[PDB]
Amino acid sequence: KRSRKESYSIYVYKVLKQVHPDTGISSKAMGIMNSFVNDIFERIAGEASRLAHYNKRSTITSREIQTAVRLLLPGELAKHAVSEGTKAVTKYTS
Amino acid sequence: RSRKESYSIYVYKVLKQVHPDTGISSKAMGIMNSFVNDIFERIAGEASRLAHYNKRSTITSREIQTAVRLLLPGELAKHAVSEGTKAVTKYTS
Amino acid sequence: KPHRYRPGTVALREIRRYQKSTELLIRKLPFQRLVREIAQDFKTDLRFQSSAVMALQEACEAYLVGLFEDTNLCAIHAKRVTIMPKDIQLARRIRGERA
Amino acid sequence: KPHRYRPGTVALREIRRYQKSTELLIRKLPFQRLVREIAQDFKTDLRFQSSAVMALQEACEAYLVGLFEDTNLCAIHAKRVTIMPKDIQLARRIRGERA
Amino acid sequence: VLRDNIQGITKPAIRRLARRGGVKRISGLIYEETRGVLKVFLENVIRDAVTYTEHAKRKTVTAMDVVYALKRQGRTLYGFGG
Amino acid sequence: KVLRDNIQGITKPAIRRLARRGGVKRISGLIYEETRGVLKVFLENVIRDAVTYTEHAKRKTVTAMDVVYALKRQGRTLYGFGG
Amino acid sequence: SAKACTRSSRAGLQFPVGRVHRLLRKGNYSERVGAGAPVYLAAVLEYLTAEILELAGNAARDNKKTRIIPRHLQLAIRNDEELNKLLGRVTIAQGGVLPNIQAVLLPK
Amino acid sequence: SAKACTRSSRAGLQFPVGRVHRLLRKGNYSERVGAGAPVYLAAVLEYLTAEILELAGNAARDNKKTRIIPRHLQLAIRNDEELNKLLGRVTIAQGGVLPNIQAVLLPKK
Amino acid sequence: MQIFVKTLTGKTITLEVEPSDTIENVKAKIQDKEGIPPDQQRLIFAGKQLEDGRTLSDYNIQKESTLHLVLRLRGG
Amino acid sequence: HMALKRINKELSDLARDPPAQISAGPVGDDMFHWQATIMGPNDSPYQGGVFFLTIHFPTDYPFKPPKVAFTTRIYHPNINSNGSICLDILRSQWSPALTISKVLLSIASLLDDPNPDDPKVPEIARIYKTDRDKYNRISREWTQKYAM
Amino acid sequence: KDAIPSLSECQCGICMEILVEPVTLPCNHTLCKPCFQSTVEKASLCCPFCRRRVSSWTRYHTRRNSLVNVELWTIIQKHYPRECKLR
DNA sequence: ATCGGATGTATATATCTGACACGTGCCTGGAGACTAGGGAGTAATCCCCTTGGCGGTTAAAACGCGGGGGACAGCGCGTACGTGCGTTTAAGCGGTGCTAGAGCTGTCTACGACCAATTGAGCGGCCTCGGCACCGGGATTCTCGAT
DNA sequence: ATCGAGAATCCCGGTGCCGAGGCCGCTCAATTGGTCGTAGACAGCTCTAGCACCGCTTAAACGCACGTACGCGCTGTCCCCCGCGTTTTAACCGCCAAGGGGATTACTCCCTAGTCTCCAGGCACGTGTCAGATATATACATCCGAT
Ligand SMILES: [Zn+2]
Ligand SMILES: [Zn+2]
């Protein structure tokens, strides 16, 4: 058998089931969603790495990702994304 | 204090090598520093991505050569490739 | 006596039909042959995956659709309904593709 | 009896003179005050280095020069020497700045 | 050897593309300019893809290479990988 | 220390001079109100990015480095001011 | 949160956290990666995916279909404002274009 | 080579090679850095700088000045066909613009 | 003998085993006196992980020894 | 604050209508701390088993879920030896609408039948799945050891 | 709607109090502004009763400043003024 | 078709000043020698799939023709902008006072890198049934020549 | 202003098909537990320059009057895409056959990260001086009403 190939299929399907319980999704939409997730991940991580290199630091804390999300996304989406990330961080640590 | 390195002496040496009887002001010197940094960052980023694409973990000479071929236009790319190949060949022996 | 539509009143119907559809608009074999010749210009004896040709066709279609939208807008700005090549050169010059 | 130039020659002379020069064309204090007003909205009690203000002024001047070049091209395309706000809007929309 | 395939893009095909774009009346000189600009775009993208294939020590192009070639130029493409 | 009605500081002769550099031979009378709005929007974007950059670094004074970085991010790369 | 349970469940997310952490470390973005960054990044990704999926599902229900196809994604992305600005450059395969006819071309 | 002189002079260059190697290693671009890459990068950078400097020097000599100011750099970059495409998005500070006027706006005969 | 085992909960338990007693008998005694499932225990003597192959005589446990218990369990 | 008033309405609600086999009361002076008892349902392997559990309320209620802990020891695949409870409603779908009565009745319902899909303890869950009689007898001896 | 509202239905489903600055969700559920303004950052960003995401509607209405309903606020304050004044 | 103001721009010469080119102390980063282990080059082998080909068949492309609508050239107008000049305004430049805050340094504590055992989340291969596509029929709705 | 006939489009029902969601088996990567060098958080000190103020210029800005050229609307003419019909062409689908090269595993060797030690190359600092900006005074290209 061929080697494993990682993908974000399961998680996208789970989120879709959480939003619209009775709605399915096709394979081409899965490819599009996987590409979109990879694109956003690379953009955010690259911006965070660049910004951490600007201030002469070696670690990428949550603050760098927060600022990268504040920069890349439009303001209205940035506010909600920052709120969601702050939730996730404050709920994970306790 | 602190030390702020730059590409000053090398650019001045190249300028003297090309035009033996000319000079360069400070503002143009900073412009040259910024341009060199920009080109270096572009080439390094492209080479790093090329190395990551093929499941490789090193940056050999051919990665830099392919990045140069991609970024620069035709004649510039050909001349830069020739110059780099000559430099590395003269360096290895 | 035979029924004939007014000049230009079926172009609107064609627009309304095509902007609703999502299929490809260029025949597969001619575009594939064009891609093959352009490729073999650079290097001899290449082999193309089908998905690669499909991606190339999709990119070309999207680019041409955008260019035609901007060209139509230029033509309407010039107080015209037709589109002429000078509109295409103006759109390319402003977009910076040619400059 | 008084000697005055035909309307238009002075404009050409100013264009020729200004395309040769390289200094800045917006007064320093008004631009600094405008930058401070814009900045104080996002965060209060900020302080600006002089080099930052100069960089902002340079970038703004270059961007406006490019926009005016494109606007003049749009105006000349429609058989009009004069430029109009519709030309600016068309240039910005085609460049994708407003979308 | 293959040649004169640029004529494969027929006039009705460009007409349909323009109709999707949103034009109502097309002059008779659009077709040659459209062929020229399409050829230029294909030349650029295919050259980038062929260079990407060359760097990988392979003698066949892959849709993945074309996707990255499009991404480098600033025209990202979804639905084919990446 | 409030600031009001200051966008008008970009006078009519200044915009005329900028257009003259651009290559404009005859300017209408409605340009001088559109140009101020365009400049305000562009400056708003650049200043927002620069203020975010100086907010991350825990500093109270912006720097030419932050402005250069914001301009490079927005696509308008700038030379001769550091970097 | 309690220990000895999966991190994705500890943080309440759906997207994986360990996978994001591994990608951050081995993707050559920095020498060191914090422990809290993957949680934040996965949360942002999940929020964006949920938003776009909800819009696509609403469009598909409006189109009287039960499965989301790329045309629904194109409609959801372009109809919204912030999402359109974020995804202005990307091209959706087989997505089509929005119906737009200039008022001048319409018959009078 | 003889493996006796400094690395920069060993390759017959003027740009440093040790600095390029350090920047490549510590600039978190990849886990490992090859031995020959920095020489290639330094050569490319030197050659590009050489072209820009010679074009600026020519533009300054045509102006009857012995110093290269940013205006000369702008003229050299904009006039050359390939360099303009390479540096299309760059904004040179105090560089000005190339002088041109559309043929329509010239005075009528 | 008498062996004291300190757990992560601070519970004091004393076991009476023999040097010749095998690990199976010790685990049976643990099951009888505690009821905790056997798969959840890998014990540590002087920083060495215990293996059921060797008996207690090989270790030669000294009198009044403190025993530490750690092992990964899914569910917390 | 608002949490205190909400607790007041909820205590009045539980006082006016007592759930079957369920009683809740504040053992400590602080209103956030609570104690409750669970009685083994008739249609369950547990018979005549009564257990005591403690409830801790966060600073903000019902925005954050309460924490429930089992002081007594129960042998169950979904309950650890320490007494922690792994429940979906407790963390995944906690909502301000849900109340303490509902979460306790849900705990009782899960106590009726283990869920192998999300096993808190893997070995106990799998040995439960393999054979009914083994789990039945181990649960019986454990509940006579602890519950009675 | 419901020009003759009962006092029992005016209770907020969360804090059990008379509605203050009501906000109506697309699921036609009404609750006081503090409850929603809290649950948007410290709850699952979904309707507590319906359990479905409302991110898009909230995102669109936040910029438009159309969260509040003037008609329901007015009818509540005129029908039950003494509960509003004590707040 | 130029003619002579009238203007602005180009050109020749003294001068003096502040930035540019260069000398110098030195210290931090670059160079030289040895080790080891993991990454990368090389060889052998599988089988996926991409190229090549023949036959049907038929939707799409090519050619021709009538003509209605649109692009383009010419004319007239009145109004908005270019040009010039007197007047009010605030940028511009020098000099000074100061302190908020950038920037460097010494400690050390808590966050993150590293490594082995382990098993459960997640991927590959199968399978079936329902949602979607195709076709036949009818109801509904723009459209245009003639009133 | 409209009627009505011809043509395109939208609904509804029936039938068939194939891929999407669920399931089972398995291999590998995330968890956990513990250990240890170090990253940066914090407190403290230094000294740079960004802010605010003052006063004296005179350069750019402002408002007004006048004239003109050009943006806009209107009208007329020709010609060229459009819509339709008829015919020729190759795209498309199905089918078969082959072997080239992508992809995988196993093996070996050598390139480079790491460590330590030693030393000179570039950096901050200071100094002399001449290139170019400034002022002043001629000489020539260019524009404008009118012969
Ligand atoms: Zn409430
Ligand atoms: Zn709801």
Write down the overall geometry of chain E. globular
Which fold name corresponds to the CATH topology of the domain at 49-99 in chain C? Histone, subunit A
Cofactors and ligands present?
zinc ion
Query: What is the fold named in CATH at topology level of chain E?
Result: Histone, subunit A
The main β sheet of chain E shows up as: none
**Estimated structural class of chain E:** mainly alpha
Subunit structure (chain K): Monomer. Interacts with UBE2N/UBC13.
Organism (chain K): Homo sapiens (Human)
Subcellular location (chain K): Nucleus
Modified residues (Phosphoserine) (chain K): 66
Structure, described:
The structure holds 11 protein chains of 7 kinds. With 82 residues, chain E is mainly α. Chain E has a single domain, classed as Histone, subunit A (Orthogonal Bundle). Chain J is an alpha+beta fold and 148 residues long. Chain K has a single domain, classed as 2-Layer Sandwich (Herpes Virus-1), CATH 3.30.40.10. Chain K has a two-stranded antiparallel sheet. The radius of gyration of chain K is 13 Å and the shape is globular. At the A-G interface, helix 1, strand 1, helix 2, strand 2 and helix 3 of A face helix 1, helix 2, strand 1, helix 3 and strand 2 of G. The PDB classes it as transferase/dna. The entry lists the keywords Nucleosome core particle, chromatin, RNF168, RING domain, UbcH5c, DNA repair, DNA double-strand break, Homologous recombination, 53BP1, ubiquitin, STRUCTURAL PROTEIN-DNA-TRANSFERASE complex, transferase, TRANSFERASE-DNA complex. The assembly is tridecameric. The entry is titled "Cryo-EM structure of the human nucleosome core particle in complex with RNF168 and UbcH5c~Ub (UbcH5c chemically conjugated to histone H2A) (class 1)".
What is the gist of this entry?
The complex is a hetero-oligomer of 11 chains. By secondary structure, chain J is α+β, with helices and mostly antiparallel strands.
